[PDB]
Amino acid sequence: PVLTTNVTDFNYTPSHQKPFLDIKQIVEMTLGSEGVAVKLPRGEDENEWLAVHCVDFYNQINMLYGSITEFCSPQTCPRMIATNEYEYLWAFQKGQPPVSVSAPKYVECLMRWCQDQFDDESLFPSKVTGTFPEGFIQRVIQPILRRLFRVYAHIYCHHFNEILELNLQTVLNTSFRHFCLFAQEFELLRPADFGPLLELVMELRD
Amino acid sequence: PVLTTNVTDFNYTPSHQKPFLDIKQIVEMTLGSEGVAVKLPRGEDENEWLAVHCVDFYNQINMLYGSITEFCSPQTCPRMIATNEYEYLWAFQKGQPPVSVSAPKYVECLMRWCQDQFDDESLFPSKVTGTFPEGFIQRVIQPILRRLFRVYAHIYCHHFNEILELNLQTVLNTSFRHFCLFAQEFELLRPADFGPLLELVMELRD
Ligand SMILES: [Zn+2]
Ligand SMILES: [Zn+2]
What span, in angstroms and rounded, lies between the C-alpha atoms of A98 and B19? Predict the structure, then answer.
């Protein structure tokens, strides 16, 4: 949930997942940085296609957070924010009210939660002989995409300078563009799910 | 030195450094992947320019190894190799003969050794009022560049598929190209220092 208005032990720890098979200033920096597979194939299963890409998107965000993880600590980022207009909250026990947490605690919990869904055989069948549950796209895929977006939002609004230092602007913008086009093709994310990055999506998408 | 012919605890650990201030198959995969600041500025000090870029190159290699580190363990890569024609060795105590070690042990030792040179005030002055030692370029910069190259060699020859999975082919090729052009401009590396990547350098450089 969304609230709209030298210690290293507690930074985000990356983990790769095995394959399934103000805002105006921020956006101008993003576009200026550049100067320095979406459709379901015919005969292919939609759930499988969406499952494949959901694990792939997790892995791109894992690689991108991992590149800057030493710059995001509970002292640099005491709240999970995407500018001062958006704060994102985490519920530690399911069905309980979400709370304010530092950005790396948030990212850690969220990413480990995604891996727990990928690793759950009743959600993501790990054999050819398994099936997907009813409501898979709405009940599993959509919540995962909505949450992974919040990680992109924190990176762009609070760590873009570091991404630029490492020359990862094009990899970041390419991943995000593919994430947003994929969500559009299947109506997984709507304009409101983009929060502070709406203009970015308007520019990058096309 | 050069010899020419589920446990996770022992993979390479990344650490960012604060800013100073067969082979034919491998090369064709590299070029096909693409379809899916060098001169000293006027009035500027050469030692400073080379010191700045040496820490920057370390940081690009750190980010690139970090992206694939879970795929390089003492079981996947029991020797530090760049194809079966080149094995690179590490001396654990200075002045002693270098030995065979696993790739991630090698990379760990080498990168931590680079940081120890960057952090040594008598080599890399950490204030405006320090000076560089005599022989800086030959005795400090050149050995560091020669060693960092061996890390690029292992990545290209043994982990390129994983770099491709993460869409980092262009970032890898861009870093390596800039590394090789920088070495050419100042004669830091010679054609022999490139070992198995000579053809790659021939294609990428220009
Ligand atoms: Zn942060
Ligand atoms: Zn390896």
Answer: 38
- Do residues B145 and B61 make contact, with C-beta atoms less than 8 angstroms apart? no
If phi > 0 it is left, if psi is from -120 to 50 it is alpha, else beta; for residue B187 that is left
Within 10 A of B22 (CB to CB), how many other CB atoms are there? 10
Nearest CA in chain A to B70: A16
Rounded to an integer, what distance in angstroms lies between the CA atom of residue B193 and that of residue B195? 6
The residue among B8, B15, B16 with the most chain A CBs within 10 A of its CB, best to mutate, is B16
Give this entry's resolution in angstroms. Answer: 2.0
Q: How far is A176 from chain B (nearest CA, A)?
A: 12
CA distance B158 to chain A (A): 18
Please, are residues A110 and A101 in contact by the beta-carbon 8 Å criterion? no
Q: What are phi and psi of B200, to 5 degrees?
A: -55, -50
Using CA atoms, how far apart are residues A152 and A173, in angstroms rounded to an integer? 10
- Token pair 């630029």: residue: A164
For residue B204, the surrounding DSSP H or E stretch is helix B198-204
Give the burial class of B152: count Cβ atoms within 10 A of its Cβ; 0-12 exposed, 13-18 middle, 19 or more buried.
Answer: buried
Helix axes B169-185 and A169-185, enclosed angle (nearest 10)? 170
Q: Solved how? A: X-ray
Residue B77 annotated as binding? Answer: yes
Mutate to test the interface with A, among B60, B61, B63, B176 (most CBs of A within 10 A): B63
State whether A63 and B16 contact (CB < 8 Å): no
Element (H, E) at B176: helix B169-185
Residue with token string 């230092």: A165
In eight-state DSSP terms, residue A128 is T
Q: From CA A31, how far away is CA A39, in angstroms rounded?
A: 26
The closest ligand to the CA of A105 turns out to be 1
* Whole-number Å distance between alpha carbons of B176 and B170: 10
**Domains along the sequence of chain B with CATH:** 1-206 (1.20.140.30)
Exposure pattern of B44-75 as b/e (b: 16+ CB <10 Å)? eeebebbbbbbbbbbbbbbbbbbbbbebbbbe
**Rounded Cα gap, residues B198 and B27, in angstroms:** 10
| Separation of CA A108 and ligand 1 centre (Å) | 12
**Chain A neighbors of B168, CB-CB under 8 A:** 63, 171
